[PDB]
Amino acid sequence: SAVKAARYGKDNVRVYKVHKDEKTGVQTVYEMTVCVLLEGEIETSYTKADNSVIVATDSIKNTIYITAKQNPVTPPELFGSILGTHFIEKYNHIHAAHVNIVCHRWTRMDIDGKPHPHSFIRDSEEKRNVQVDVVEGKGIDIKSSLSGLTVLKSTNSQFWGFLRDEYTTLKETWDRILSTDVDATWQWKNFSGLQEVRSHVPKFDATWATAREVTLKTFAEDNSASVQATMYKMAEQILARQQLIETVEYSLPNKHYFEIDLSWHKGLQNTGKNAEVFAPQSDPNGLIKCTVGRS
Amino acid sequence: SAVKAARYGKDNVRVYKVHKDEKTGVQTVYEMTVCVLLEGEIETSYTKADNSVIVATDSIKNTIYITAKQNPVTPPELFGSILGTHFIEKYNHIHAAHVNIVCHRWTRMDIDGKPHPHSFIRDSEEKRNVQVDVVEGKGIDIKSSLSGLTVLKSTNSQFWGFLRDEYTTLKETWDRILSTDVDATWQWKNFSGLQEVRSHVPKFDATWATAREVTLKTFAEDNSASVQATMYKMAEQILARQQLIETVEYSLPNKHYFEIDLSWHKGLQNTGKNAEVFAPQSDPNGLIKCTVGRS
Amino acid sequence: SAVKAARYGKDNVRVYKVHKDEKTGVQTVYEMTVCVLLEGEIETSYTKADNSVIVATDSIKNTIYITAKQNPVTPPELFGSILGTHFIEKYNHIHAAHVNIVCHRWTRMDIDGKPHPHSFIRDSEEKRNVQVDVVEGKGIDIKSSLSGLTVLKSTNSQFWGFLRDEYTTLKETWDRILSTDVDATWQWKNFSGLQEVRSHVPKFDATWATAREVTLKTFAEDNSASVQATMYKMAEQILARQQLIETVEYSLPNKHYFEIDLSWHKGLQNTGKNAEVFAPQSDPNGLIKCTVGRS
Amino acid sequence: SAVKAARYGKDNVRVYKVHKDEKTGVQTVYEMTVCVLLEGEIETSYTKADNSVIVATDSIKNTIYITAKQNPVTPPELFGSILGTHFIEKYNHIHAAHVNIVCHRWTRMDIDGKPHPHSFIRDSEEKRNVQVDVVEGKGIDIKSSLSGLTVLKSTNSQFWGFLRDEYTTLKETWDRILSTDVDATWQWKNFSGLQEVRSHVPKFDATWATAREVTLKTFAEDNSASVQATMYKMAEQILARQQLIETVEYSLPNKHYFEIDLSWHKGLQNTGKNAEVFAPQSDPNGLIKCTVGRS
């Protein structure tokens, strides 16, 4: 036998950081969950019980906290690039570092219509994420994403004109509910190293804001022919608004809301134009994916 | 043997309802999860295989949807009272109906600074709940609550002066992080029946807004001596602002954020006034409860 | 305002203990999750910021580990009684201690048909639980339970003869699937204190084994008229086999498996006696409860 | 813009099937969760609102149930190959079908030491899975796996000799607890189509049994130098026992159990050889991966 691929590290590392402005007295908090997996000349730890090549996962954890102490943790594209660069520079035998960051929401509270200097709310489980792959000799590859953005529109979605054969029972519709959990990922141009990532730092928060804004406005305003056609519109707009990204990927479930025929009970009309009460369906669900690139 | 207590029904019934204003073109959505458990002269279904006394759970489900078609589903205190009243009136042998409602958030979207007529976002997993117990001969007992309201303050929490003995290792602190998931419940005066519940309908949304506002402002502004002392302040203020509630109950976890001593690494100072990076702890957690009534 | 009820403590405390027999070389492991909530003369911590009455939750955590070091952790009825007794004896102002224990499964592995001396498997998420309430002046109240025992029978369940009215659509059946997650609780006679609990220690594991065996055999062998009638049989048998318990409580969901009519496709017959492929339903679910006592 | 990749279909489709032997009266149940994603000449559904190319996801769901009615659902490698082959043969414009199957455990009950003909238990959340990729022109690619197999050994694990530098605080150990959730995947030789998959059908259950047996016995018997070294041993043994698989992949978390120093309390000794009570850690966790192929 032979090792064909190997990586190891620390997952589910919870990290909080606070920034304090003691001129203004305003505090700002950041919370994330970090994973770091390393690759390199490590196969003998698997084949020969040679632990000399292992940077212990506990030491990887220590390194996350130390790096967070010594650097800004935002934007996450930058923090992940600094962290991954550390590992491949510090350790001659480590040749790639793979950093995932899940960013959790702590939105400043407004109290009596003024922002509070040190109190925050989790306004939803939506996440902002990065995957930063630092590969020695080959730069830094970054994917950015938003996930867990759960939305619903009650009309201005349609689905008709689909293939119909002996497996088909679904009725065409010109007016349905559409609800989904948005997972949207933008893939950046390869960066040559940390310096280039630093040179683009303002584009990271700006591109996440553009992706979110395009998602929300397109979802709300598109009289949707299908999940596929709406998601494609979102992707092309994001590509047109940030030339340093190469592709945009969407993964959208179709979280179904079924009409309920009540006409068996006192003639009640609850279907079609009369549909008011629906049964949200936990499973199954459609799942629609696409990756959009430039022509 | 003998049956001492028995109840049965349908749980986890997902319900959506839409309201359409075709003068303004504005749609409004509501989504909940309902459970209904019935009690009455039903013991023979357990002891003698007598199913004649059972209102099938599927029929209970049908009844939830029909009631939702025929009535407003808001406020949930009203909807639960209508639903529970139906069961004890319709069925001579059913003497109590226990209705739980979990209300899910679908907040209208703002697009380009205007509210959208039919697009919504799940802005957090915070719930609004009711437990409505309709008991024949004895009125309607309602508990209202908010749950899953997750908050954090980065300073202006303290914990010192606690008991110290041979089991104690915890250091006193005059400046700590406080984070919790708020579960707050207000218990209404018994209502004599549906008419009385209807007569108070505006107080339900108003009291939920008061509880939420008091929670948020007290959490943000109290320089907290302990979780106990802060939660008590919230409860007394809610009681002073709604005379039709009898008690306020809080259940608050203390979701710990631990300092990380890094001085073992290049002398790094990250404790006390220098604390910037912390380790959020998933478990264990303090859990602090109280029920506050009037003197 | 006034405090009407208050309790505080530590939740979600994970605990492992190992026993090593260095005559036989056999090791045995135990893993649980513990919560302890205390009551007593503590209201001033809520109303007056008086932390002197608080046994810090961290010290409660320390106490769980110390008690686990100094005593057997099995059976959980005993461990919870020792722990709760400690708090009300150690602290004059603490008058009740409420201990919940969730016991996790670590079943010894068999390798090449022999039990392994120190390797274990989690053979399901079924739990064994206790709630032990130690109340000064009033003894020790113990509830024991098994939960998360998930079972299915593919036939020999029926449901017919139920009430039928204008809310009913469900078809009678003489042959259905029955699946549930069993939650079964037995409530012990009040114990006067720790000595009496100790005097009954072998009855705790024996009664849990009886409850489990009765559950499994009755579920498998009863040609069930309804969930209610089967669960009642289980409860009466457990009461007849342990005179020191006063009541048995069951809470059983009816996790539905729906037939799928495929006759629209090439005449396929998949209903009634021809039913082979079914759609398991995640929600909603029936929920059936009863508490059985002695006549 | 241009579509670079696209796939769509139905996820989270719950399926039960029963087999009845009415000579022996024995029933056997199978339960799974299925996902099917299709690829092909479908980009115009995204770019031009052309739904003519879409096989509706509801029809994909119908097709899963129909295929389950008409064929055995075991072994899952076979069922997934039949299902995926259907889509690329039925639809000229569909060129790949990607089928995931999660198989749930329903183990026959033993009652009074005899197997019961129609009653079953969920003996753990361990799953058996397949990913079957049917690609027109290019055969069938199958990955098989076991996941959620949670194990613990209380001794006969070590971790010493790892790299030590200014980021290292971890103490070497010659006797630790090792616990993990096993995710193990074997990748089969490409099959030319359904006929070849059928020709190997007995090897699927046999190879899953070999992988499980090798995992369990190696975990229990290896005096482990590290997670890496133990997992590698498992992989090489599986490769030596099934020549039709090309690689074996393991992904193992190191679910940490920390010693608890209690010597601050009455001199209690609970570390090193005296370690009996431990704190299981929910997060973070080491994560160790490797893919093993043949030399």
Ligand SMILES: O=c1[nH]c(=O)c2[nH]c(=S)[nH]c2[nH]1
């Ligand atoms: O692409 C990745 N996504 C993740 O969410 C993740 N988590 C860990 S660990 N590695 C990775 N890689």
Ligand SMILES: O=c1[nH]c(=O)c2[nH]c(=S)[nH]c2[nH]1
């Ligand atoms: O937008 C949709 N895309 C699909 O592929 C599909 N299939 C079914 S069913 N509804 C929908 N809706």
Ligand SMILES: O=c1[nH]c(=O)c2[nH]c(=S)[nH]c2[nH]1
């Ligand atoms: O008090 C209750 N709370 C709940 O969340 C609930 N759910 C069901 S079912 N009954 C109840 N009762």
Ligand SMILES: O=c1[nH]c(=O)c2[nH]c(=S)[nH]c2[nH]1
């Ligand atoms: O506010 C608090 N109440 C407590 O009872 C307690 N115990 C520990 S530890 N921290 C805290 N904080």
Ligand SMILES: O=c1[nH]c(=O)c2[nH]c(=S)[nH]c2[nH]1
């Ligand atoms: O009766 C109880 N059951 C539990 O599961 C639990 N958990 C905590 S904390 N107290 C309690 N009390």
Ligand SMILES: O=c1[nH]c(=O)c2[nH]c(=S)[nH]c2[nH]1
């Ligand atoms: O055993 C049952 N009890 C019930 O109350 C009920 N209701 C429906 S529907 N099925 C069942 N089955």
Ligand SMILES: O=c1[nH]c(=O)c2[nH]c(=S)[nH]c2[nH]1
């Ligand atoms: O490789 C896969 N694994 C899965 O668990 C899965 N689920 C769906 S949908 N496709 C896939 N593909």
Ligand SMILES: O=c1[nH]c(=O)c2[nH]c(=S)[nH]c2[nH]1
């Ligand atoms: O087996 C192990 N592999 C590792 O890479 C590692 N790191 C730490 S910490 N413990 C362990 N154990």
Ligand code: NA
């Ligand atoms: Na390197």
Ligand code: NA
């Ligand atoms: Na009645």
Ligand code: NA
């Ligand atoms: Na006391």
Ligand code: NA
């Ligand atoms: Na094809």
